[PDB]
Design a protein around this motif. Structure first.
Motif, PDB file in Angstrom:
ATOM      1  N   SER A 174      11.218  23.906  88.792  1.00 49.91           N
ATOM      2  CA  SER A 174       9.942  24.355  89.369  1.00 49.91           C
ATOM      3  C   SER A 174       9.356  23.467  90.473  1.00 49.91           C
ATOM      4  CB  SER A 174       8.880  24.500  88.275  1.00 49.91           C
ATOM      5  OG  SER A 174       9.025  25.756  87.621  1.00 49.91           O
ATOM      6  N   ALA A 175       9.570  23.943  91.690  1.00 46.37           N
ATOM      7  CA  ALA A 175       8.873  23.442  92.887  1.00 46.37           C
ATOM      8  C   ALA A 175       7.514  24.154  93.030  1.00 46.37           C
ATOM      9  CB  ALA A 175       9.758  23.646  94.116  1.00 46.37           C
ATOM     10  N   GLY A 176       6.512  23.490  92.459  1.00 50.31           N
ATOM     11  CA  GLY A 176       5.135  23.998  92.339  1.00 50.31           C
ATOM     12  C   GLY A 176       4.433  23.332  91.145  1.00 50.31           C
ATOM     13  N   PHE A 177       5.133  23.341  90.020  1.00 49.79           N
ATOM     14  CA  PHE A 177       4.647  22.730  88.769  1.00 49.79           C
ATOM     15  C   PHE A 177       4.823  21.204  88.775  1.00 49.79           C
ATOM     16  CE2 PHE A 177       4.320  24.016  83.941  1.00 49.79           C
ATOM     17  CZ  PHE A 177       3.036  23.415  83.881  1.00 49.79           C
TER      18      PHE A 177
ATOM     19  N   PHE B 179       9.227  16.706  77.948  1.00 53.74           N
ATOM     20  CA  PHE B 179       8.305  17.790  78.371  1.00 53.74           C
ATOM     21  C   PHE B 179       7.539  17.610  79.702  1.00 53.74           C
ATOM     22  CE2 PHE B 179       8.469  18.259  73.590  1.00 53.74           C
ATOM     23  CZ  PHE B 179       9.235  19.449  73.566  1.00 53.74           C
ATOM     24  N   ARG B 180       8.191  16.941  80.656  1.00 58.78           N
ATOM     25  CA  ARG B 180       7.674  16.902  82.041  1.00 58.78           C
ATOM     26  C   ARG B 180       8.342  17.961  82.931  1.00 58.78           C
ATOM     27  NH1 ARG B 180      10.992  14.538  81.828  1.00 58.78           N
ATOM     28  NH2 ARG B 180      11.138  12.593  82.960  1.00 58.78           N
ATOM     29  N   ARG B 181       9.656  17.845  83.121  1.00 58.55           N
ATOM     30  CA  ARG B 181      10.411  18.751  84.016  1.00 58.55           C
ATOM     31  C   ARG B 181      10.523  20.174  83.489  1.00 58.55           C
ATOM     32  NH1 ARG B 181      14.693  14.217  85.216  1.00 58.55           N
ATOM     33  NH2 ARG B 181      13.414  13.003  86.642  1.00 58.55           N
ATOM     34  N   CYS B 182       9.983  21.090  84.288  1.00 55.95           N
ATOM     35  CA  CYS B 182      10.087  22.536  84.058  1.00 55.95           C
ATOM     36  C   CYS B 182      11.313  23.104  84.774  1.00 55.95           C
ATOM     37  CB  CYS B 182       8.786  23.195  84.499  1.00 55.95           C
ATOM     38  SG  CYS B 182       8.779  25.028  84.445  1.00 55.95           S
ATOM     39  N   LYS B 183      12.300  23.421  83.947  1.00 52.41           N
ATOM     40  CA  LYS B 183      13.574  23.991  84.392  1.00 52.41           C
ATOM     41  C   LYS B 183      13.726  25.428  83.935  1.00 52.41           C
ATOM     42  CE  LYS B 183      17.536  22.136  84.398  1.00 52.41           C
ATOM     43  NZ  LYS B 183      18.584  21.299  83.810  1.00 52.41           N
ATOM     44  N   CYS B 184      13.891  26.244  84.956  1.00 50.67           N
ATOM     45  CA  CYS B 184      13.744  27.700  84.836  1.00 50.67           C
ATOM     46  C   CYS B 184      15.004  28.521  85.029  1.00 50.67           C
ATOM     47  CB  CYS B 184      12.592  28.132  85.742  1.00 50.67           C
ATOM     48  SG  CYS B 184      11.046  27.498  85.001  1.00 50.67           S
ATOM     49  N   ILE B 185      15.007  29.572  84.227  1.00 53.73           N
ATOM     50  CA  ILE B 185      16.139  30.499  84.074  1.00 53.73           C
ATOM     51  C   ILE B 185      15.959  31.761  84.909  1.00 53.73           C
ATOM     52  CG2 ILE B 185      17.882  30.574  82.291  1.00 53.73           C
ATOM     53  CD1 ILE B 185      15.369  31.456  80.384  1.00 53.73           C
TER      54      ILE B 185
ATOM     55  N   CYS C   9       4.786  19.682  81.903  1.00 58.85           N
ATOM     56  CA  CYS C   9       4.787  21.104  81.471  1.00 58.85           C
ATOM     57  C   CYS C   9       4.345  21.338  80.021  1.00 58.85           C
ATOM     58  CB  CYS C   9       6.121  21.796  81.766  1.00 58.85           C
ATOM     59  SG  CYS C   9       7.667  20.962  81.232  1.00 58.85           S
ATOM     60  N   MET C  10       4.633  20.352  79.169  1.00 64.25           N
ATOM     61  CA  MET C  10       4.241  20.196  77.752  1.00 64.25           C
ATOM     62  C   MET C  10       4.754  21.194  76.718  1.00 64.25           C
ATOM     63  SD  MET C  10       3.597  17.331  76.803  1.00 64.25           S
ATOM     64  CE  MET C  10       3.643  15.863  77.813  1.00 64.25           C
ATOM     65  N   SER C  11       4.904  22.435  77.144  1.00 58.83           N
ATOM     66  CA  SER C  11       5.459  23.519  76.315  1.00 58.83           C
ATOM     67  C   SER C  11       6.274  24.484  77.192  1.00 58.83           C
ATOM     68  CB  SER C  11       4.370  24.275  75.550  1.00 58.83           C
ATOM     69  OG  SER C  11       3.881  25.433  76.246  1.00 58.83           O
ATOM     70  N   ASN C  12       7.358  24.946  76.583  1.00 60.36           N
ATOM     71  CA  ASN C  12       8.210  26.020  77.115  1.00 60.36           C
ATOM     72  C   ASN C  12       7.446  27.201  77.729  1.00 60.36           C
ATOM     73  OD1 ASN C  12      10.270  24.388  76.103  1.00 60.36           O
ATOM     74  ND2 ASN C  12      10.846  25.765  74.477  1.00 60.36           N
ATOM     75  N   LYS C  13       6.388  27.608  77.027  1.00 58.95           N
ATOM     76  CA  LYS C  13       5.556  28.760  77.398  1.00 58.95           C
ATOM     77  C   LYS C  13       4.828  28.544  78.741  1.00 58.95           C
ATOM     78  CE  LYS C  13       3.639  32.653  77.178  1.00 58.95           C
ATOM     79  NZ  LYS C  13       4.413  33.900  77.283  1.00 58.95           N
TER      80      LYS C  13
ATOM     81  N   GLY D 284      12.370  33.354  83.314  1.00 59.30           N
ATOM     82  CA  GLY D 284      11.865  32.511  82.215  1.00 59.30           C
ATOM     83  C   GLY D 284      11.979  31.026  82.573  1.00 59.30           C
ATOM     84  N   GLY D 285      11.767  30.180  81.571  1.00 58.98           N
ATOM     85  CA  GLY D 285      11.883  28.723  81.754  1.00 58.98           C
ATOM     86  C   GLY D 285      11.569  27.897  80.505  1.00 58.98           C
TER      87      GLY D 285
END
Length: 47
Positions: A7-10, A38-44, A14-18, A31-32
Motif C-alpha cells: 500500500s502506497a498511501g497507507f 502490523f505496520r506494512r499493509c500488503k495487498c492481494i 495498519c494494526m489489523s488485516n481489516k 483485499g489485503g
C-alpha cells in the motif's frame, strides 16, 4: 497471478488485516493483510 504489493498511501501501522484491506479496496486491490508487527499493509489481487 497473485499480486501481492504494498500500500502506497497507507502511511504507518495498519494494526489489523481489516484496516489494511479497506484502504486496498479503495486503492484497486481485491483485499489485503497487515504484515509482520502490523505496520506494512500488503495487498492481494489477481493479475
Amino acid at each position: 497471478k497473485i499480486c501481492r504489493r504494498r500500500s502506497a498511501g497507507f502511511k504507518g501501522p495498519c494494526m489489523s488485516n481489516k484496516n489494511c484491506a479497506q484502504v486496498c479496496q479503495q486503492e484497486g486491490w481485491g483485499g489485503g493483510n497487515c504484515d509482520g508487527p502490523f505496520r506494512r499493509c500488503k495487498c492481494i489481487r489477481q493479475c
